Symmetry: C2
Subunit: 702 residues, 2 copies
């Protein structure tokens, strides 16, 4: 029991580390041998005012940081955090061993701070706090819930470690310390209660970034392992002073010797990631605005995001009455994609976002249908809302500081992105119309067993779709996994049948014009994908992973989208006294004994018979439910309008028949026109993205 003293009114303690670490370290200054705990009781935007600091400012010469790396955990195990930290450590070692550089050199580790923001003490895993402790950046015992009647909001552990991670097997993490290791300035933040990730970013940007004043702030998730040069290659993107943000490639981690490529769900995701990087990101980067993918690690120039972008990201549209507005109350769905928008359309500034193909990070993807569905629920809602928001507010592009040509390019890009969003909104009707027109056409033309197959597949589609709607509105994907797997299999068999029908009709026609169009259009859209993959110099996914993606595409359209739209907002709808008796059964009491007090109580109850909206949380819940259920209805109705126009469903064929009688066919020419239009749109999108990727590679190569 020792005597302490609050330093400037807040608790700062310095503990020594165990001699086991010292044994490696010797093989010595102050930062290596101590670990500093601080109890942060204030808001993220008030740390300096309240007089809280970081070790970097307190040296004889204050230490200036070039690069702040933020790692966010919620409950990730020690393997994921180990992978992220090992990638970071390897990158820092690469930068420290750099020879001909003005910025990096033997003491480059002093310019990098690794800030690990974990979200809740109750929600952290103990295998992660055991890894963090083994590095030297955590000791238990001196965390406090409250200090001078002030609720402690966050615990900050600061250390500079010499030990590095050198191997991460399936079970063990290899930690070692020798002359080849590089020191890392860790900064472990542990929030007291679980607020979501935007609050973690609030702590990173409004909090420690204000004290450290980094040049670049890099965002990573736990489990995302950066490549061996990814951080350096992303940092190299910022030598253009106009770059305000940047991102790299995100790769599926295929496992040992690509063993996980046997899983159809994983190969489908591998193909999807490779094409999203090759086609979408390059095309976007040509214009100057990128919509960074959820898994990839990104970097923002700190001066770029200060001001309006962070205010919109953290608070939303501040101007708001007691009620709820659409954009202001729903922008939390598009979490990081807001920042990017506000960086590009920042007033009087000509920041651009740029995509770096030289930097990559590999992540593990869901291997089971329920967790895959739950992961994509967030992605699809975020993308849809962000695209709607960017289209509705595009005039801001013209209030920024870009020159006239870049403003025109950005306007064109936003229009194109909303065109893509609009196409993706009508996929529910597009898939059904293509399937029904194709199967019915082959049944009409050849009659053999395609009649029964057409009816059977119509009923299978209907049953699976109705069940998906009902289970996603009412139940949870964990509860019914066999059904979801069966539905995916049913849709894969459906797609196989459609491919067969297309090939059969095309061969018979070659031995009418619509199937000429289908063969030319689909061959063209496959060839453009293949050539774009070759130009990017990453073609191997075009054969190892293509058929799996083709077979699972109907499940992307029909299971992921339905669940994403049905779950937009993740809704969640006096003490008396005691008796303790003695041995004799006796005890003492306070009892109303006087007649006057009994009469008083009687009069107080005789008085009640003579004198004859809930809280904000449930009001917000009601608004969220109303807005989530109005989206589903509009989606379904606007898709069925197109279905009924093309196929003459909804009693329309009946209506035309009876109008003529006042003075039904099997199929019309609307089906032919629509079938052609859909395929031409697909081929056109492929061609546009091919031109974009070609321009990207040509410019980078020059």
């Amino acid at each position: 029991i020792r005597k302490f003293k609050l330093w400037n009114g807040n608790f700062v303690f310095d503990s020594p580390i165990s001699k086991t670490l010292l044994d490696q370290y010797a093989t010595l200054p102050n930062e290596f041998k101590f670990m500093r705990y601080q109890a942060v009781t204030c808001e993220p935007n008030q740390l300096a005012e309240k007089n809280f600091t970081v070790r970097q400012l307190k040296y004889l010469t204050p230490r200036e940081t070039e690069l702040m790396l933020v790692v966010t955990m919620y409950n990730e195990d020690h393997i994921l955090l180990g992978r992220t930290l090992k990638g970071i450590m390897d990158n820092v070692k690469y930068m420290v061993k750099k020879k001909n550089s003005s910025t990096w050199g033997p003491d480059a580790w002093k310019k990098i701070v690794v800030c690990i923001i974990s979200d809740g003490r109750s929600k952290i895993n103990e295998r992660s706090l055991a890894l963090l402790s083994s590095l030297g950046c955590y000791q238990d015992g001196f965390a406090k819930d409250e200090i001078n009647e002030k609720k402690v909001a966050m615990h900050v552990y600061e250390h500079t470690t010499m030990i590095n991670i050198t191997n991460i097997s399936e079970s063990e993490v290899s930690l070692e310390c020798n002359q080849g290791t590089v020191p890392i300035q860790l900064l472990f933040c542990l929030k007291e209660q679980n607020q979501k990730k935007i609050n973690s970013h609030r702590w990173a940007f409004e909090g420690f970034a204000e004290l450290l004043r980094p040049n670049i702030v890099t965002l990573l998730d736990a489990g995302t392992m950066p490549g061996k040069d990814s951080i350096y290659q992303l940092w190299r993107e910022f030598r253009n002073p106009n770059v305000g943000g940047a991102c790299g490639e995100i790769r599926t981690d295929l496992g040992k010797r690509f063993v996980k490529l046997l899983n159809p769900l994983v190969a489908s995701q591998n193909f999807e990631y490779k094409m999203s990087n090759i086609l979408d990101k390059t095309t976007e980067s040509n214009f100057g605005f990128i919509t960074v993918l959820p898994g990839a690690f990104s970097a923002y120039r700190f001066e770029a995001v200060r001001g309006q972008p962070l205010q919109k990201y953290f608070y939303g549209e501040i101007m708001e009455n007691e009620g709820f507005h659409f954009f202001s109350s729903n922008m939390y769905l598009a979490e990081d994609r807001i920042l990017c928008f506000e960086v590009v359309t920042k007033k009087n500034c000509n920041w651009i976002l740029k995509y770096c193909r030289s930097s990559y990070a590999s992540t593990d993807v869901p291997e089971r249908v329920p967790e895959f569905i739950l992961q994509r629920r967030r992605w699809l809602n975020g993308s849809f809302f962000a695209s709607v928001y960017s289209f509705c507010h595009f005039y801001r592009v013209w209030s920024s500081g870009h020159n006239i040509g870049r403003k025109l390019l950005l306007t064109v890009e936003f229009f194109y992105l909303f065109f893509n969003t609009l196409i993706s909104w009508f996929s529910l009707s597009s898939f059904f119309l293509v399937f029904r027109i194709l199967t019915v056409s082959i049944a009409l033309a050849y009659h053999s067993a395609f009649n029964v197959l057409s009816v059977i597949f119509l009923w299978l589609y209907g049953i699976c779709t109705l069940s998906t709607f009902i289970l996603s509105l009412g139940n949870k994907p964990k509860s019914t996994e066999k059904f979801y797997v069966l539905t995916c299999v049913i849709f894969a068999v459906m797609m196989i049948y459609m491919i067969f029908c297309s090939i059969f009709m095309s061969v018979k026609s070659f031995q009418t014009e619509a199937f000429r169009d289908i063969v030319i259009s689909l061959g063209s859209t496959y060839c453009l994908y293949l050539i774009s993959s070759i130009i990017y110099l990453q073609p191997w996914h075009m054969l190892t992973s293509f058929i799996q993606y083709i077979l699972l595409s109907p499940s992307y359209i029909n299971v992921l989208n339905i669940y994403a739209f049905c779950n937009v907002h993740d809704l969640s709808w006096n003490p008396l006294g005691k008796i303790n008796t003695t041995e004799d059964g006796t005890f003492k009491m306070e009892v109303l004994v006087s007649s006057s007090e009994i009469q008083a109580n009687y009069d107080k109850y005789l008085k009640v018979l003579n004198d004859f909206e809930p809280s904000y949380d449930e009001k917000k819940t009601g608004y969220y439910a109303n807005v989530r259920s109005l989206v589903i209805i509009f989606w379904v109705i606007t898709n069925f309008i197109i279905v009924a126009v093309v196929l003459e469903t909804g009693g329309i064929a009946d209506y035309i028949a009876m109008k003529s009688i006042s003075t039904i066919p099997l199929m019309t020419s609307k089906a032919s026109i629509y079938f052609n239009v859909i395929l031409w749109l697909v081929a056109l999108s492929a061609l546009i993205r091919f031109i974009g990727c070609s321009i990207y590679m040509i410019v980078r190569f020059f």
Copy 2:
């Protein structure tokens, strides 16, 4: 403080009442001047063993009860409880003033106990505890949460009051005491925490009824006001020794001078109640098994329900493994209807249930669409499950003790009840098929503007139905009231249009055979209703309330049923330390100072890196969700199968067309056959129920 003593180990206290009551009372024995609080810490089935008692057993001559009246509250205000208590008091006064009776006489009040079981202290209203206190049956202060480390489960207040309720206006309750008043033995039970109503019945039947040993146990809800002779007329039903249960008529309370009859929702309910009593209850009572309506007050002969019926009602099918079974885990949905079944099919006993028309009780009905929907959610699920359970287990009728004729009658009745259930399961398709066939037929025949009307009403029906499904699966009726009112109005206009179409086609035909059938069948089914109402001697609802019921019938089919099926089960998915500092900012702490303990903690975290289904409530929640969502899917699919068979939807007309091509019409003869069959079923049901009501009245009159 004073010195007390536990009486036999449990807390029993006797407080005097305020002299204000004594002033009326004088205008005196022990029961009037004291109120007895008991703290019940045991289970309902253990009160006697634990040595708890009631005042009735503790006189010099123990008092024998003929009739125990149970009143259950949850949070009902003082007007509803006042109405119930006033009806009870008036009935007891009628029985006490009875002259030529062996059972009732001047001291008949001694044979009646009124047991008011309120559900939770936190959930009780204070205007109800103020009314209960004003009667003399409650004083606060001496309720206890725990007694000798035993959680007190329930508080029992016992008094015999001389004051009666004489008027209940919209705002005040008139209490008065004079020579004309009759004493009432009240027994106020107040549960500590809110378990649902089955637990209240568990306390009433397994608890106080075991001590009091009543002859009859009568169940009433708070707000249900018995008629001036209803309790006596129901008690008179039990002079037949074979009667095991009985119920009376439940009436809609139309307000002052029938002012509430202006509300269409209230007149519709008035007609529905009058026909459920006139047709359904009499027909059921002829056979010998009644399915007592939710609002009506019922009575059970206590010896009838002891044993198997109460065991099934309270616990369910006791034989059960760790998993969930359908019947055993879902019988709580059909709460009281289980008892009735088990009374009739009790082994070796020939108990019957009987319906009493001489006894009635009037209740208030919901006047707003959301609360109406929420009320009927419980009714519809209970009825559907109870009917399924009774049909599946009908063989028990033959294991009972009835003679052969009554066994045959009961078997026939259960078959007929399941036929009615099966008809009610297909109303979703029946209404749509009737509407679509009728509108399309008039459009075909006369062409003028019925084409547009047919298409418009098809789209209106589709939009309203899809929206009802989506809002009942995802949202709450309180949130969207304008939409539900609008949907009811839309369906009423739809029904008006259908009535017009029927009349138009019939008049044109009179100026083909199918409309002869429609006019004859509907005229017959209206005439049978009118004649049955006249035979029952209650015809006034056949004109004051008929059109409102007709207009709201589509909303009964399409809004109440969808919401009831979509909401079957009502699913619901270390401390650290503190710092207080002195003036100097100094304080004292317990800190790991020795190097050995720091090394110990480091080794304990280095150890975690080397040694590398939830609770029952959420498992039951998952089962309930699976079973609720499997019911909706089957309901929708089995109704659409009939729709697609009759109208040739679902690609079937396409399939027949292309089969013939291998070698679509507007309407077929299946529509004619189905249209006739539906109306013949309606007329047949009306005729059967008319014969039943006629037999009931004839037998009662003889």
